[PDB]
Enzyme design. Structure first.
Site, PDB file in Angstrom:
ATOM      1  N   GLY A 168      43.865  34.146  36.366  1.00  0.00           N
ATOM      2  CA  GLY A 168      45.187  35.634  35.963  1.00  0.00           C
ATOM      3  C   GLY A 168      46.085  36.314  37.645  1.00  0.00           C
ATOM      4  N   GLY A 169      46.795  36.649  37.651  1.00  0.00           N
ATOM      5  CA  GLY A 169      46.403  37.512  38.460  1.00  0.00           C
ATOM      6  C   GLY A 169      46.815  38.892  37.927  1.00  0.00           C
ATOM      7  N   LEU A 170      46.743  39.287  36.648  1.00  0.00           N
ATOM      8  CA  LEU A 170      47.236  40.117  35.851  1.00  0.00           C
ATOM      9  C   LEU A 170      45.884  40.998  35.980  1.00  0.00           C
ATOM     10  N   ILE A 174      47.557  27.203  32.276  1.00  0.00           N
ATOM     11  CA  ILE A 174      46.527  26.989  33.239  1.00  0.00           C
ATOM     12  C   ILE A 174      45.732  25.726  32.939  1.00  0.00           C
ATOM     13  CG2 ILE A 174      43.998  27.406  33.327  1.00  0.00           C
ATOM     14  CD1 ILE A 174      45.590  27.906  35.769  1.00  0.00           C
ATOM     15  N   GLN A 181      42.417  43.670  37.012  1.00  0.00           N
ATOM     16  CA  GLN A 181      42.271  44.326  37.404  1.00  0.00           C
ATOM     17  C   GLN A 181      41.489  43.147  39.281  1.00  0.00           C
ATOM     18  OE1 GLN A 181      37.844  46.808  38.087  1.00  0.00           O
ATOM     19  NE2 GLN A 181      39.955  48.441  37.879  1.00  0.00           N
ATOM     20  N   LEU A 182      41.242  42.700  39.378  1.00  0.00           N
ATOM     21  CA  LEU A 182      40.542  41.702  40.751  1.00  0.00           C
ATOM     22  C   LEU A 182      42.269  41.207  41.316  1.00  0.00           C
ATOM     23  CD1 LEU A 182      36.984  40.326  39.548  1.00  0.00           C
ATOM     24  CD2 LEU A 182      37.116  41.831  40.801  1.00  0.00           C
ATOM     25  N   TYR A 231      29.565  33.395  27.517  1.00  0.00           N
ATOM     26  CA  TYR A 231      30.146  33.401  29.000  1.00  0.00           C
ATOM     27  C   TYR A 231      28.844  32.801  30.218  1.00  0.00           C
ATOM     28  CZ  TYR A 231      32.598  35.979  33.001  1.00  0.00           C
ATOM     29  OH  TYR A 231      33.063  36.191  34.099  1.00  0.00           O
TER      30      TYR A 231
END
EC number: 1.1.1.103
Lengths: 292, 295
Positions: free
Chosen positions: A9-11, A45, A13-14, A118
């Site tokens: 997901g491009g929203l 996705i 921080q990275l 995780y």
């Protein structure tokens, strides 16, 4: 031709940081985020069809997967990338190791029994990707991220949260209550190094890769050691300690140092930010002079 | 008196365990479960219930209605979502969960001579990968929640009435057909390919025995279990004790050859012997003997 990049997901921080880096190298219109600065689509996705559509339309050659949601989504991402000969990056983490792992240092290949959901997902992420590389032709590339430190981390919460928030107090030469016991060492890396590694491993030649998952590291430090390097620029800065055992428990389960010998030997990975360059660059993003 | 449930009940492993546990605990105290219709003889042998592991509520219903306290999960896109349902329900109702792992859960990067109970686990079969997943989710649930999860890494199992179902372990059971009438057998694996194997009798006993053990004695919750390891030429050699005219010919299948080579040669099961007294009865001679007396 330069690659055509998808990020998801491009929203996060990275995601944003990476788009910035990759847009500068390949062009604004060659990098497509997904979840004004540049091209942007909505993408599920979780839906293979939508994911397939995007890859084909925009002629995607590179994919950076930053997003049951994990698994079904990961599997979907794996299937699309393999079918259309996409170079796939998916990051892992130091959470992928556990108490039974060699902590000092953790090598690239070792026991991995994380006691966190995780962590288990990321073991699975690693293994599924490698599986797809060996069975099918999937150019799968994976880096284990240390604690990532960033100034713009308006996101609070996390195990490596203190190393970001501590600067807010140090900028005003104030005091900081630390979540973790004084001498709690963890691997750590500044977001600049982290994104650069992500790019570099994705630029490496295939044959030079002796494995498809790599540790990357820059430094490891303890709260009291971070406070030391902070006083270089704010001497009256004090550091108290008020522990959250849940954050300590998880922290003690992670390794103290990551050995990244393979990343260095295979694709020339080197870090630019040690504890001083970190501290300086971070304090600069607040209002502090770092000349000395 | 443990109230037992068995998912994937119509498996050769499932029926065998039911046969073992009913004999020990009572016919009504052990329930078989599966999604599809059973053969005639298992209907009569004891209780049977349709159970869709992918539907949480149906699985919860069985566990509460039949007051289940022991569960053996043999069911395994599909598998891993059913595992999570089994995990939740077991934790929810304080059920002793058993899920089997495998030797296929190791890879080239693992120690292979022998392979410890704790080591590098990077299998190159989707099935191996998902079993590593199974191990970790089971263990995760034991530490985080109160789940009493117990797992054993089965070697290649050898059973009497197994079909030509294409495992890598398949040659060791199909060989006994040609050898029972001194014929010739063609091996898909190379002549010197060593793998851990085990007779089904031990496998079930081990499964029962690890669930009978008390928690405090268990250092870990996923143990290896061993009995023997052998190569085709060693197996052929043992078959020629009772049938010297039996012949073996090698037409190597590179696919299984690669998978066989990806797996360990021997399993170190030290921990299981120390912790809960594991001991195999069937070495190669006895296995070869016992198998021939069902032909």
């Amino acid at each position: 031709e330069p690659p055509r990049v998808l990020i998801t997901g491009g929203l996060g921080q990275l995601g944003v940081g990476l788009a910035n880096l990759l847009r500068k190298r390949f062009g604004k219109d060659n990098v497509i985020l997904s979840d004004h600065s540049g091209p942007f689509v909505y993408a599920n996705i979780l839906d293979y069809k939508s994911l397939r559509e995007i890859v084909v339309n925009h002629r995607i050659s590179w994919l950076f997967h930053y997003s049951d949601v994990n698994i079904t989504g990961l599997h979907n991402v794996l299937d699309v990338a393999a079918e259309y000969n996409v170079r796939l990056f998916v990051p892992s983490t130091i959470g992928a190791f556990g108490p039974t792992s060699p902590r000092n240092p953790a090598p690239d290949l070792c026991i991995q029994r994380p006691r966190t959901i995780y962590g288990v997902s990321k073991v699975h992420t690693e293994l599924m990707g490698e599986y797809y590389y060996y069975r099918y032709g999937l150019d799968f590339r994976c880096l284990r991220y240390p604690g990532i430190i960033s100034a713009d981390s308006q996101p609070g919460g996390g195990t490596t949260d203190y190393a970001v928030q501590i600067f807010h107090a140090a900028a005003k030469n104030g005091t900081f209550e630390c979540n973790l016991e004084a001498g709690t060492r963890l691997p750590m890396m500044y977001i600049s190094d982290c994104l650069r590694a992500t790019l570099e491993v994705m630029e490496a030649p295939a044959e030079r890769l002796s494995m498809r998952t790599y540790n990357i590291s820059a430094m490891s430090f303890t709260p009291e050691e971070l406070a030391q390097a902070l006083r270089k620029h704010a001497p009256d800065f004090q550091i108290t300690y008020c522990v959250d055992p849940l954050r300590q428990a998880i922290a003690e389960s992670w390794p103290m140092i990551l050995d990244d010998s393979n990343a260095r030997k295979d694709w020339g990975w080197k870090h630019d930010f040690d504890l001083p360059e970190l501290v300086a660059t971070m304090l600069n993003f607040h209002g502090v002079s770092t000349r000395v």
